[PDB]
């Protein structure tokens, strides 16, 4: 389903990384936030929703979504209810970037552009646009 | 051309809003930043580039792009060198949102989903995915 996203937080260097994965394609978007707050989550979802047609969202930590702030963002946007990899890539480019923030966006870029390999080879980034377009 | 973006900053309530416009489609992405810094611009471009195939970027204030930090982000991502409207929509939803940050993302959502009207009617959001997909 083209409207399904997965959203979780992961930790690195005492910082929090918000990671969204478009399930059908493997495409991700990430943000480094100070702390794991409901206000940060609602904001992130609002941004995601104004860019892709987000219908439902899943998470591995359900308590992530209980705040009224998050519920308010989902209601308004009309939303209903890679970490190892991303972390690896992030590990690989970490020295090239001065800040974790920058290493993370570099990792997202690398991951989304990586072609599945072979004749043609499509990346998660190509896959998401095709799936949404076709739909 | 599907790879062209326009990027500028605008001001509201003593805050700075970074606005990116995909020229061919009218699709926008925005971020509210504390100040108009080169580090903020490079970061924003890195995020944009890992999500869309960004080839060139234009701005109405060329000095915006002179920092080594911005030039470093463009080099790495391989990048070469609506305000009234957005501001209006933002004006319209401002009371509904507690913070400017939130009103801005609501405005972006509204603008990207607005269909051109008529039989079929496509929005900037639908247009960008089609243009990139087809390409």
From Swiss-Prot, chains A, B:
Ranges where the Integrase catalytic domain occurs: 1-132
Domain of life: Viruses
Known role: Catalyzes viral DNA integration into the host chromosome, by performing a series of DNA cutting and joining reactions. This enzyme activity takes place after virion entry into a cell and reverse transcription of the RNA genome in dsDNA. The first step in the integration process is 3' processing. This step requires a complex comprising the viral genome, matrix protein, Vpr and integrase. This complex is called the pre-integration complex (PIC). The integrase protein removes 2 nucleotides from each 3' end of the viral DNA, leaving recessed CA OH's at the 3' ends.
Upper classification of the organism: Viruses, Riboviria, Pararnavirae, Artverviricota, Revtraviricetes
Residues annotated as binding Mg(2+) 3: 8, 60
Cysteine pairings via disulfide bonds: none
Complex formation: Homotetramer; may further associate as a homohexadecamer. Part of the pre-integration complex (PIC) which is composed of viral genome, matrix protein, Vpr and integrase. Interacts with human SMARCB1/INI1 and human PSIP1/LEDGF isoform 1. Interacts with human KPNA3; this interaction might play a role in nuclear import of the pre-integration complex. Interacts with human NUP153; this interaction might play a role in nuclear import of the pre-integration complex.
Spans traversing the lipid bilayer: none
Localization per record: Virion; Host nucleus; Host cytoplasm
Record's protein name: Integrase
Entry remark concerning the domains of this protein: The core domain contains the D-x(n)-D-x(35)-E motif, named for the phylogenetically conserved glutamic acid and aspartic acid residues and the invariant 35 amino acid spacing between the second and third acidic residues. Each acidic residue of the D,D(35)E motif is independently essential for the 3'-processing and strand transfer activities of purified integrase protein.
């Amino acid at each position: 389903s083209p409207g399904i996203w997965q959203l979780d937080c992961t930790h690195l260097e005492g910082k929090v990384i918000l990671v969204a994965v478009h399930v059908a394609s493997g495409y991700i978007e990430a943000e480094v936030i100070p702390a794991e707050t409901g206000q940060e989550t609602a904001y992130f979802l609002l941004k995601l929703a104004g860019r892709w047609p987000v219908k439902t969202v899943h998470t591995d930590n359900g308590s992530n979504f209980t705040s009224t702030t998050v519920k308010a963002a989902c209601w308004w946007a009309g939303i209903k209810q890679m970490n190892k990899e991303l972390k690896k890539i992030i590990g690989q480019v970490r020295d090239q970037a001065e800040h974790l923030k920058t290493a993370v966006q570099m990792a997202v870029f690398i991951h989304n552009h990586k072609r599945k390999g072979g004749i043609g080879g499509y990346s998660a980034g190509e896959r998401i646009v095709d799936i949404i377009a076709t739909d």
